[model samples]
Target: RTTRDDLINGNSASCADVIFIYARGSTETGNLGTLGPSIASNLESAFGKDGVWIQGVGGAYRATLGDNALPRGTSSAAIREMLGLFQQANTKCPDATLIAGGYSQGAALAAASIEDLDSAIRDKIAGTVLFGYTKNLQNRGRIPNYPADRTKVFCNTGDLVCTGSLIVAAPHFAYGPDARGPAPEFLIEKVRAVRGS
Candidate 1:
């Protein structure tokens, strides 16, 4: 039985040029969000929807000092699920390019899990786009094994989440219009470069 939470945007039991594992921000239902969908659209646009696979991770959306202290929810669960799906895709499409991105809490998850990704999968990851990344959690030094040039972080000015301010949550959601255009464009370019097309 496939529920909406288990739904994947692209077919995974087949070959593809790229597989995108996109994690959505907190409170947004399912795998849908500004940054996730934009990147997925651009990847599909470049390689055709049939040639790109997208999986959205969904779980508990609660946010509290307790959860924030140890931050468990979709983000934590997403890492495990994303890797499993990536492994499946790798078996089915060895040559497929890989992409990962997230917004807000989701971005934190991507940052946390990316460094630990299997070497083969990490090597295949052409680019990672993170929006509204939590500065409180991200490692400022570097992302493990991922090339510095391949990862793009988009945080709007005054975004408390990225800046570690947390005065208000409004700026956290401000990444919508600002990131919608550029994030996907960046992903498309990376996908094209990896595909050599």
Candidate 2:
């Protein structure tokens, strides 16, 4: 079994030219839910094998009702773990373009990590795509400040999380069909912009 640590370290420290950290929604594993993997797939197509892809997991407790759990691989702890990897990559490959995004709770975690990331590392982040982000997070000021033009947020028309209508699964899960093209395109532009800069 390849441990999460193995993934954090990756095959080579200084190999990736672009790094993507993808967080899965609650209860979904392997490839990220609809929009998450789609963007990643397109990213791979664009960046080739030089991209480092990290799939976040073990945060399923968020799916449980009234479960107040934030384990090592979830919530802020997950952010800490991820930031360490981000920092390692930054130190090893200072010129690498970094991208991070997630869906649902994972989106929240991504937002948290971005908020706390070192300014130098944050500058290396060329793009961020958050799907089904909650208004509650914004209200609480959890969503960090990033270059507005460099980040994109996708939410279904009736999705309660972004709109804060109600906690319904269907609307929350409705991202892939709409975001497939735009999200990847956004990152591609970011990559181009970074390279140009």
Candidate 3:
């Protein structure tokens, strides 16, 4: 049976002061169980002691099954689940901030998650960080849309993982180096800088 534990954290303490909800590229291809150690360690380094993680639902792996279903393999479903998680988590940590992230198709999902945020709590977000994304959405491929003034998009220049799809949504804030090289470390630093100590 599909369970929240499979996708979210019930005890807020096990969670980070902030949450990083990552979208798996394809539920069929990706699972948090696969990335658990690396992700936990990364968060511990970034946020220390109580860092926690929640994997978003969708793709080949849906967080909810059947009737309660949100669209798997879609940018939209990812956003909805993220927002709902925020509402749930906020009830406990009232001041908690969330960072949505994804790689490749998951990158697109992260972007869409920001757009779906409630107007009131939207800015409360620390920011978004995407890897293996294509900046040139128009001529390249399809991706989630973001506001130039709000979110942060870090795309890989030549990495095949990015879709390169264009969509006019957010104005570009900062464009970092590609994932194939030193670009990602810089992006991680930038996101860390934005996170409150």
Candidate 4:
């Protein structure tokens, strides 16, 4: 019942109990990529699939090295695309819990998009799961202005990329499996909180 990758480009088909919007890491194929889907797959199971809509940020996010290196603000297209999608999901899924996340540079993009979102839109974000977060070291593992309890950053102990370096290491590729538990758990907990309240 889960269309984990089709929610991109405002393709919701219809609203669900939760909208999971994620961006992929640099050079990864598919919008969700392995890690992003892994988290969504597990989270969907917890919600029984039908209640969740998975969205990969749509636009010109190539995630190439050059693209990753560009100033975060310079990535105007992605920010705009991500922003609009969040707005649409919020408007379209009025009672649904809103979740957002990404891997690697996409995590950085996700962070900025959240930072740029309107105050009302930002308050609706129920939770987030950022794996291989690109700015872990820069923000001391925080998602900038986001509330700490609502965000979960899964940066492996040795991923140099998490340290804000360009070097990809062995730990970087293991998020799909390693994050399968903690990532989904955090989101499920946060989602339950909003629904329960």
| lDDT (C-alpha, whole model) for all candidates | 0.65, 0.64, 0.45, 0.78
Best by lDDT: 4
Q: Per-residue lDDT of 2-121 in model 3, one digit per residue for the tens?
A: 112422545655444665565543332334322222443455465554554444544333422121122322445555665676566556555556555554445554555555666566
TM-score leaderboard ranking: 4, 1, 2, 3
Regions more than 4 Å wrong, model 4: 1-14
In the range 1-197, model 1's lDDT, one tens digit per residue, is 11122224444455667777776776565465555665566666777867777766554333222333354323455567666666766776777888877777777667667766788778888888888777433456245667878888887777776666444467777776645578877777887786777
Which pairs, if any, clash in model 4? none
Question: Could you list the CA RMSD of all candidates, in the order they appear?
Answer: 3.7, 4.2, 7.8, 2.7
- List residue ranges in candidate 3 displaced over 4 A: 1-7, 12-15, 27-30, 33-39, 58-76, 134-136, 139-152, 160-196
| C-alpha TM-scores of all predictions | 0.81, 0.78, 0.59, 0.89
lDDT accuracy of residue 171 in candidate 4: 91
- Candidate 3: C-alpha RMSD after superposition: 7.8
Worst 10 residues of 1 by lDDT: 1-10
lDDT of 3 at 159: 47
Better of 3 and 4 by TM-score: 4
Off by over 4 Å in 2: 1-9, 51-74, 136-142
TM-score of candidate 1 on Cα atoms, chains taken together = 0.81
Model 3, residue 182: distance off in Å is 7.2
